[PDB]
C-alpha cells in the first residue's frame, strides 16, 4: 500500500513543469522594458508559485514520511519478539 500510494505522488513532482511556466515569465520580466505595474505583478504570482512548489514538494514529504515512519514502527514491532531463545530450553527437554 505504501508502494502503491507513493508511485503516483512522485510523478506529480517530476512532470509538474511549473518552472517552465516561470520561464515564460522570465521572458516576460527582463526581456521587455515592461510596465512596473506588471513587473511587480508577474513576480508576485511567481513568488506564490515557487512557494506553491515548496508546498507541493513538502506535501509530498508529509505523504511520504507519513508512510516511511509508519513502516519503521512496524519493523520494530516485529524485530523485538525473540521466540527462538525462549524455547531452546523447551525444545531440548522434549527432545530428551
Amino acid at each position: 500500500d505504501s508502494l502503491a500510494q507513493l508511485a503516483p505522488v512522485l510523478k506529480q513532482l517530476t512532470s509538474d513543469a511549473a518552472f517552465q511556466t516561470i520561464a515564460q515569465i522570465d521572458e516576460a520580466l527582463a526581456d521587455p522594458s515592461l510596465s512596473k505595474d506588471d513587473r511587480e505583478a508577474l513576480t508576485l504570482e511567481r513568488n506564490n508559485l515557487i512557494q506553491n512548489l515548496s508546498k507541493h514538494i513538502d506535501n509530498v514529504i508529509v505523504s511520504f514520511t507519513g508512510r516511511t515512519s509508519k513502516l519503521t514502527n512496524k519493523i520494530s514491532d516485529i524485530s523485538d519478539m525473540v521466540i527462538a531463545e525462549r524455547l531452546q530450553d523447551l525444545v531440548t527437554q522434549t527432545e530428551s
Binding site: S76, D77, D80, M81
Partner: peptide
C-alpha cells in the same frame, strides 16, 4: 518509545 506495544501485550498475556 522503549516500552513497546508488544511489551504491554506480553504482560497482559
Amino acid at each position: 518509545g522503549i516500552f513497546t506495544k508488544g511489551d504491554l501485550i506480553n504482560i497482559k498475556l
